[PDB]
């Protein structure tokens, strides 16, 4: 018999490359459009007494 | 009410009357027509 000679060891994987950056994350708008209005009307009441 | 130079609504009575079964069967589904009259029970009274 003979001794097994050294095995080829694993390596540390290269790792992940990251791009630095600035982000703005947008979502679907569920908010209704809002604005100002003015109503002009007249309450007309006729009473039969 | 009809004034001298104007007309005014004194009141507008609005009501929803059901279409009777016989009119649905015999007029609407049979011919696509409705009766021009509404005969129905409102406030414990038969009104036409």
From Swiss-Prot, chain B:
It is found in: Virion membrane; Host cell membrane; Host endosome membrane; Host Golgi apparatus membrane. Residues 1-6 are annotated as: Involved in fusion and/or binding to host membrane. The cytoplasmic tail is phosphorylated by the viral kinase US3. Phosphorylation may be linked to a down-regulation of gB expression on cell surface. ubiquitinated. Envelope glycoprotein that forms spikes at the surface of virion envelope and binds to the host cell entry receptors MYH9/NMMHC-IIA and MYH10/NMMHC-IIB, promoting the virus entry into host cells. Essential for the initial attachment to heparan sulfate moieties of the host cell surface proteoglycans. Involved in fusion of viral and cellular membranes leading to virus entry into the host cell: following initial binding to its host cell entry receptors, membrane fusion is mediated by the fusion machinery composed at least of gB and the heterodimer gH/gL. Belongs to the herpesviridae glycoprotein B family. Homotrimer; disulfide-linked. Interacts with host receptor MYH9/NMMHC-IIA. Interacts with host receptor MYH10/NMMHC-IIB. Binds to heparan sulfate proteoglycans. Interacts with gH/gL heterodimer. Interacts with host DEFA1, DEFA2 and DEFA3; these interactions inhibit viral infection. This is Envelope glycoprotein B. The lineage of its organism: Viruses, Duplodnaviria, Heunggongvirae, Peploviricota, Herviviricetes. The chain holds residues 174 to 221 of 904 of the full protein.
